[PDB]
Design a protein around this ligand. Structure first.
Ligand SMILES: [Zn+2]
Ligand SMILES: [Zn+2]
Lengths: 150, 150
């Protein structure tokens, strides 16, 4: 376990042959209101475009997943709600340890980059047409809706 | 765009303030047979455990997504089938450009690490019980099944 770089949101290490990127865990929030899912978009320099995502962010020190979810929902959309843990996933276990905890948000109330309310069916249609790209969180949100929220 | 490392499956660069990990695009294959989904597990040093995933891999030079999907299905499970493109997603746009192309595989036939045939309902139940972890591809497979394959 030799480190080649220790940055702000990630560290680059090596375990003999495997290249490993240590990354802070994250959260994502699925929220549906009047048939529209709460998507967000922001410039993502790593990909050069703004994919359709859902409120999400890194868990801060001292924070647990639930608290981070509450914070990201409020900071990115100015909303609060009743949160329920759904499931988790490793974004790409072949090279990074980033783990994402997904929550469902209900009974949204306004308490205070781009907020994109859109029907999941439309988000899927646009993607299939090549009009918009998805982040893992965005796709998970869309599939979750089609599977359990209709 | 300054590079700090150029490795085998990834490069670590910087765009002023943003730390960016360039990564080859990948593919994942969703396959259902007699109610069981085709999951695979392998030791993942980056996470220290073996999450439930679906056949997947990096696209090789000269290969397009469809061809890579065919290859990974055959190399990891020894199967071939009729493939259909479903959708794509960026695993974690906040720091990497890894894009995953997801395919559906039907009419599987045997042509030649661990193959785990399991009902998606059971995979979800086990995860909720904390018995197994999911990779993004595994979760996408499970949600896709619940949404469109029942
Ligand atoms: Zn944030
Ligand atoms: Zn492979």
């Amino acid at each position: 376990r030799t480190y080649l770089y220790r940055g702000r949101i990630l560290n680059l290490a090596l375990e003999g042959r495997y290249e490993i990127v240590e990354h802070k865990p994250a959260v994502a929030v699925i929220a549906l209101r009047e048939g529209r899912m709460l998507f967000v978009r922001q410039m993502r320099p790593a990909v050069g475009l703004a994919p359709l995502e859902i409120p999400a962010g890194l868990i801060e020190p001292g924070e647990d997943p639930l608290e981070a979810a509450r914070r990201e929902l409020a900071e990115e959309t100015g909303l609060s709600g009743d949160l329920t843990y759904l499931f988790s996933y490793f974004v790409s276990p072949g090279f990074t340890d980033e783990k994402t905890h997904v929550f469902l948000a209900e009974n949204l109330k306004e308490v205070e980059i781009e907020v994109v309310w859109m029907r999941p069916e439309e988000a899927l249609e646009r993607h299939q047409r090549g009009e918009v790209e998805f982040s893992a969180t965005g796709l998970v949100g869309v599939l979750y809706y089609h599977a359990f929220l209709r």
